Design a protein around this ligand. Structure first.
Ligand code: MG
Ligand code: MG
Ligand code: MG
Ligand code: MG
Ligand code: MG
Ligand code: MG
Ligand code: MG
Lengths: 67, 128, 36, 188
RNA sequence: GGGACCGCCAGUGGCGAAGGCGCCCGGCUGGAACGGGUCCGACGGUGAGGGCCGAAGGCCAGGGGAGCGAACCGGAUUAGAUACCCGGGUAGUCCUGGCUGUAAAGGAUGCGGGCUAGGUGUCGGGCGAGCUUCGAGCUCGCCCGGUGCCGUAGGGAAGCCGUUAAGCCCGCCGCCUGGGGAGUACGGCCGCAAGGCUGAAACUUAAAGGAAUUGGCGGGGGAGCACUACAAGGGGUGGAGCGUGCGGU
RNA sequence: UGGAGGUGAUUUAAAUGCCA
RNA sequence: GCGGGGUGGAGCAGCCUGGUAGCUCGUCGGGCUCAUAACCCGAAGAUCGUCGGUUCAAAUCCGGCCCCCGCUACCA
């Protein structure tokens, strides 16, 4: 409903057509409040961002050795 | 003492996923949930999400009848068929302790033959 | 049937396993129908 | 539904020669149903030293005197993950299986496993199996059912094979893999 | 309660004339390698005609039938689908007694003897040095016999073979003579049936086949691209009326 | 440097082509 | 015993539960393709055999009738 998370590192471009980006976020208020997970995002991303998500447990599938 | 414990049998293949919570002997069931009892598309009936939801609604109704911990037994079809667990195993185990239960020892009990019987197909496989 | 391996080569012809099967179905008729 | 509310929790007890201790709880309506349920607890849940966590025991009940399920030893087994890691290439496992009996008259079947240190011939592989039979049958003559089992799982027969067989070919990790009782004495 | 198969260790490892052979304990039985100042005294190589052994399948008689599954019955996919995919299933697959005698039965390489550089693994036997928790144990070197790889001289159209020859010699037997017609017709001898062994001519045709080389292509693999590609976006053409070019009449 | 084996997997439909 | 089918080039739906005449092979036009078959889209086509009743209002409820018929045999 409100869980924000703060990006710390980008991993690369997934996507059937180079659309989504895999990125390693860090939650900052709620159930984990400190854990590190991996998620796919749509759009552009720098480091230090603040995504808003809704589950805090999905852990997108690993990418092809980052290349 | 007053410490109830139990076992969770997690049966997973390429086509579905069943979670079964029983008492420590194994002979009295408490909660049994599947994947086609939550999702509707037969595509994602084996998916990780289906396991993640069923394995939550199992723990919910099994925690109310007193159970505090649970041991794990993960199983694949095995025998004269595939020996590798599907995609719901690591997802169900990971969303069973996140739901409030504890977790003791883990193990896999897939049945293996010492040179048993014959598979399907025949001498040429599934030439799909 | 005293076969020769030059004919399994499939280049400009049809399968030999299926030609033999058709020679047999004719030798069965030249024999029943007054191959006596 | 109420069907759950008519249940009743019983306390299971280990056998005598392992130390009568609590092992799990168990629900049922009437005790005439809790009469052949099989429990399984690792060795470490009874006087636990972290090292023998990979040995498992079986206890099967025979009596319900008012919220107490007294049991009787039934079998013993290692864990496939454990023995799954002692068998590598160039190491020549050796496998023995024997039917024996004891003083009380119990009949047992023991399945002990030796693991050489290299690749060896087979006429040098069956000498070891004969050694194992000869020190099992013997050891099963002066020891009763309760004392034989006490040391099979314990690890006091491994250190005897690992003595008389190391003088055939230097080995590693001889031990007992499974026990299953077959029959009872008609007496008692 | 019930029938079939014996996993990981398992190894261009072992045994057998080939087909082939994988749980453990006992009994009967065939062959080969090594060690041998043992014995007999050329007893040998090959083999037309004959003789036994021979995967899977099919057949004839009695049993058995768990899994799988030709024919066969249904669901789908497709323009059609007598097929590929799914749910079932009879003969078979297993045991005892016989017959058939065929495979890409392949090292596509018949069998015996002599000779012509090296290197390097690994299984069985023996010898000699070192260790040794004195174990039927571990390293290292040499001789003999099986089994793999790189490679001189030489051979070959080349691919590649190279003391396990496709090298240089001394033996014996089988088969080949452009592609089709054709392994067919006719005639014999086997088999209960299926079928096996032997096997031409009229006529037709200028090529059929082998090993390698540049390219092109793949509903093969990697690397890189491009708003006459996509993804993210802005404006539209395709429907109405007219301007102009084309087909047709 | 360079090769030889083994076990696994391999994804809806998708046919056809004057004349020089 | 007397009753049914009466409807695009067609084949039948489509009733009782009344207000699109309904889906498919066909017909001409356009897409896709280097081009043809298959595949997608658009229009044209009976207007319910016919008089009549019900019905605000009918293939749709039925009767009268015109056509095609239709399950059926010498009855000493
Ligand atoms: Mg040839
Ligand atoms: Mg002869
Ligand atoms: Mg089938
Ligand atoms: Mg063979
Ligand atoms: Mg396909
Ligand atoms: Mg073509
Ligand atoms: Mg077309």
């Amino acid at each position: 409903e409100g869980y924000p998370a703060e990006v710390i590192e980008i991993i690369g471009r997934t996507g059937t057509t180079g659309d989504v980006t895999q990125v390693k976020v860090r939650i900052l208020e709620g159930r984990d409040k400190g854990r590190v997970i991996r998620r796919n995002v749509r759009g552009p991303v720098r480091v230090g961002d603040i995504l808003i998500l809704r589950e805090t447990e999905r852990e997108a599938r690993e990418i092809k050795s980052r290349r | 003492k007053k410490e109830k414990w139990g076992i969770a049998h997690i049966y997973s293949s390429y086509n579905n996923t069943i979670i079964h919570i029983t008492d420590i002997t194994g002979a009295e069931t408490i909660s049994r949930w599947s994947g086609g009892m939550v999702v509707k598309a037969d595509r994602d009936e084996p998916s990780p999400y289906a396991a993640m939801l069923a394995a939550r609604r199992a723990a919910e109704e099994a925690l109310e009848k007193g159970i505090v911990g649970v041991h794990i037994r993960v199983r694949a079809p095995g025998g004269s068929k595939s020996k590798t667990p599907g995609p719901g195993a690591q997802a169900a185990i990971r969303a069973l302790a996140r739901a409030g239960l504890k977790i003791g020892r883990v193990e896999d009990v897939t049945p293996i033959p010492h040179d048993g019987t014959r598979p399907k197909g025949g001498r040429r496989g599934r030439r799909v | 049937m005293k076969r020769r391996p030059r004919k399994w080569k499939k280049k400009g012809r049809m399968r030999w396993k299926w030609i033999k099967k058709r020679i047999r179905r004719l030798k069965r008729q030249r024999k029943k129908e007054r191959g006596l | 539904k109420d069907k759950w509310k008519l249940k009743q929790w019983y306390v299971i007890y280990a056998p005598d020669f392992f130390g009568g201790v609590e092992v799990g709880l168990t629900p049922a309506d009437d005790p005439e149903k809790v009469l052949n349920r099989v429990v399984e607890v690792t060795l470490k849940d009874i006087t636990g030293d972290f090292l023998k966590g990979h040995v498992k025991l079986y206890f099967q009940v025979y009596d319900v005197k008012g919220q107490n399920a007294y049991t009787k030893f039934k079998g013993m087994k290692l864990a496939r993950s454990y023995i799954r890691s002692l068998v590598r290439r160039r190491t020549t496992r050796i496998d023995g299986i024997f039917n024996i009996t004891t003083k009380d008259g119990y009949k047992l079947r023991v399945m002990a496993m030796v693991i050489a240190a290299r690749r060896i011939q087979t006429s040098q592989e069956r000498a070891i199996r004969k050694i194992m039979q000869e020190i099992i049958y013997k050891k099963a003559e002066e020891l009763n059912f309760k004392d034989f089992v006490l040391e099979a799982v314990n690890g006091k027969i491994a250190a005897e094979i690992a003595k008389e067989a190391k003088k055939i070919y230097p080995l590693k990790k001889a031990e007992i893999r499974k026990i299953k009782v077959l029959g009872e004495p008609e007496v008692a």
